[model samples]
Target: AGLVAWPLSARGERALRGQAGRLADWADAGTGLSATASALVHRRSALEHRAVVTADSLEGQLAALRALAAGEEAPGLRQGQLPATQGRLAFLFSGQGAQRAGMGRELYAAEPVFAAAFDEVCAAFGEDLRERIFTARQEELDRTGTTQPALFAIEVALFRLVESLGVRPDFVAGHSIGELAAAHVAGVLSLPDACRLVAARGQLMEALPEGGAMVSVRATEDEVRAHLAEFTGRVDVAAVNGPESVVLSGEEAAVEEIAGRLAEAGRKTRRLRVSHAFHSPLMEPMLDAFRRVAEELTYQAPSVPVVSNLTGEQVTAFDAAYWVEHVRRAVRFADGIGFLASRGVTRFVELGPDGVLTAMAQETLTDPETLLLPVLRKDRPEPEAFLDALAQAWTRGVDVDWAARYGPEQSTGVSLPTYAF
Candidate 1:
């Protein structure tokens, strides 16, 4: 068997080395491989105990930790077992409404290597794409036609730029429209295929004259449902952002009118800037059109699990028929976060224009240690600060020298693409 060495601290390292010396001495005594194995096993157990013990007292903690091996009780270890060598990183892709003009300008400036990728985006799209991102032209960008594709470009650019820096996430996830980009980056779909699908999605959104709208209300889904009891029109709960936050979507007028009623009823309501109502029955007509376009495209199983906004679960199987229904289905962002948390995810990095999902995720997790970060800041043009914050979060408990790792001149850039691709 191979030996794995852990970077234990000084005192602990000394103890571990001393134990290893004793094991070597046992091997020399010709006690056989079994004896050597036992000696190593004893050393590992002692080292593991030292690593996990805390001021709370080892006896109680060990009792609890050992209990987890049996089905009788829960383990209460102060720290988790350290990995032998591998590091798991999760890639976060941005979602809609997070797109902004000149958003990637700084990152591009800092890393000149990304110009080729950006060129590809501009060539396929247009020269005015950068301007289009910053200026929120809901009528222009919101049409599934513009929003989906434009957001895809931004997400891909960011993902590549980070990758160049040698930071690769073990998993990838995106909120709403961001999922397409995540699917692409995760190798579930080709970049060209993603672009094609996004553009096709835009066409479907544009062709359908009858579009819907959504409004987020600061109330529970049940409370909002009760509040909407008086409305004769068909408005539905599109998403439950949190226990105190919900989104409703339906016909344009119905959504607006119901939102007005909600506001009048002392419920805080904000009409989301989305062009059309997403994840609602109102988009049912567009589903058939979307199906026709999506059916032509091929998708491979993702390398890592891609959590769905509609289901809040990892999509293991890709069903063409199900995706059509998914387009019109409401998203449960809060539930998705809960599902991720249950799967051992304690940290979240929002990738979009704003920290919309991050804000929502932070609100739901009750654990104070849960880390949440929106890599891009609302006011800051560069992503370096946020990137540094993530590094700090990752290297916690270890001797992390932030200044040495990311010095002053090596910060993120902000130079936009001057010429078109």
Candidate 2:
């Protein structure tokens, strides 16, 4: 017994140390091993010694242990496989205020699909969009005209990259200009058509007089509506981001006044840095011109389901009028997400430069089983961040084609120690 104890202790320490070091290395290198494999290795090693000594048929017992270790469902289990459950995949597109300097520079440099798609879109613009996106100053990127087309280009490129990796969404939704991108990916608009429309939309928006502002207020939609009743046409709800998070857009003075009142009442408020009051009556000025531009382009039914910002419901037919109305209508992003969730969408992927929509989706979807993933983040390394999102989706049984992700790179899986018990 003493001899057996010493060997068991030594083996367990060795296995634990080896795994700990490997996990730490992966973390340091900004990569990770399969979580299922790691858990299996740990559990098998833990029970190895105790079960081995008393077992009559050691070979058969080991076989059962190995089966359990491979993530096979044990008796009485309903859905114990990797990813745990199956549901529809939804992609959420981010709108304005999600842009930053050098948003897609890293991916453009590293990913062939992203670069090709980006260059194709850049060819449509008069100015050097590639130069502005890769090296422009923050102020330059913040211009409504620049931001809209640039964001549209990046989102399109990112979607292409993700699609190349064999991930496709059953449903798509967007906030403000994000809807345009969603429409494009859903086959309602060709890439060139989407680019032209967004360019015209952005130019018209930027041409508007810059005397309006937007503020995010933490309150119910009804509460916001009641508060805005006092101001009447002076201010309006631009977006309902969550149950408690609402955006007010209007003249700068009116928005500021409402924000001040909310603060005084001990309610939380955040002033958004925007050039114009988007999705409000002030945006009405551009509706007709944009409508004409939208009319010039052909309309099509969506190939994939698209949730409308104007209606907060899945829309099959999108026309010029819908595009025009989307300009000034309050964005029902929270409601759109709820609509998706109600239809059994458990995975929400935000395809944008940052995770603004992902955060909003997390707040909107309360289910613990729901998975919210962001394709890129402002603070993370681009390739690593993308890889992390890819891994997360793959682990959840979303059918990620690893061959597409790592083309021609022949790799073999490494075997880790199994438990003695």
Model 1 spans with C-alpha error above 4 angstroms: 1-89, 121-144, 226-233, 260-266, 397-421
TM-scores for all candidates: the values are 0.69, 0.78
In angstroms, give how far residue 307 of model 1 lies from its true place: 0.8
Q: Pick the candidate with the highest lDDT.
A: 2
Model 2 worst lDDT window (10 residues) = 1-10
Residue 236, candidate 1: alpha-carbon lDDT = 76
lDDT of 1 at 248: 91
- 220-314: candidate 1 lDDT, tens digit per residue: 77777875665434677777778788989878878888788778888998888776667766666777777887787778888877877678777
True lDDT of residue 310, candidate 1: 72
Question: CA lDDT, every prediction?
Answer: 0.65, 0.82
RMSD to the true structure for each prediction, in A, is: 12.4, 14.3
Per-residue lDDT tens digits for candidate 2, residues 1-421, read 2221111123467777787676566568553335535554455544432111112376755655565567564322112124434689998888998998888888887889889988988887658899988899999889999999999888888998999999999999998989999999999997777887999899999999979999999988887786787787778899999999999999899889888988888889999989999988888888888988898887778889999998899998888888888888899999999899899999899999999999998778877678898989776778757876776676555668779865654545644446523
Model 2 ranges with Cα > 4 A deviation: 1-84, 408-421
